[PDB]
Every structure is written in C-alpha cells, then in structure tokens.
Amino acid sequence: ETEKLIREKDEELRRMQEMLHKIQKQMKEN
Amino acid sequence: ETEKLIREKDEELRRMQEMLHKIQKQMKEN
C-alpha cells in the first residue's frame, strides 16, 4: 500500500512537469 | 522572469522526485 502511494506521488510530480513543459512550449510558440 | 520562474518550479518538482526515490530506496533496504 505505501509503496503504491509513493509511486502515485512520483506519477503526480511527472504529470506536473509535463504540464509545465507544455506551457514552456506554448510560450516559445507565442 | 516568468521563464526563469517556470524552470525553478520544474527544478522543485525534480527535487521532490529525488526525495521520493530516496525514501523508496530506504524502504527497500528496510
């Protein structure tokens, strides 16, 4: 259970970085 | 300034992942 919870938190942090990268790409296109 | 701010947030997210990986390693070790 705890191991899965920590993996979920790592996934959340990756998704947050994916969003920031998409903003960076759109700012470069702008 | 905003470009630097977004890079700073990405660095923060990577440091949070580094911390989770250290916890994962220590849990596996016991």
UniProtKB/Swiss-Prot annotation, chains A, B:
<comment type="similarity">
    <text>Belongs to the TRAFAC class TrmE-Era-EngA-EngB-Septin-like GTPase superfamily. Septin GTPase family.</text>
</comment>
<protein>
    <recommendedName>
        <fullName>Septin-4</fullName>
    </recommendedName>
</protein>
<comment type="subunit">
    <text>Septins polymerize into heterooligomeric protein complexes that form filaments, and can associate with cellular membranes, actin filaments and microtubules. GTPase activity is required for filament formation. Interacts with SEPTIN8. Component of a septin core octameric complex consisting of SEPTIN12, SEPTIN7, SEPTIN6 and SEPTIN2 or SEPTIN4 in the order 12-7-6-2-2-6-7-12 or 12-7-6-4-4-6-7-12. Interacts with SEPTIN14 (via C-terminus). Interacts with DYRK1A.</text>
</comment>
<comment type="function">
    <text>Filament-forming cytoskeletal GTPase. Pro-apoptotic protein involved in LGR5-positive intestinal stem cell and Paneth cell expansion in the intestines, via its interaction with XIAP. May also play a role in the regulation of cell fate in the intestine. Positive regulator of apoptosis involved in hematopoietic stem cell homeostasis; via its interaction with XIAP. Negative regulator of repair and hair follicle regeneration in response to injury, due to inhibition of hair follicle stem cell proliferation, potentially via its interaction with XIAP.</text>
</comment>
<feature type="coiled-coil region">
    <location>
        <begin position="1"/>
        <end position="30"/>
    </location>
</feature>
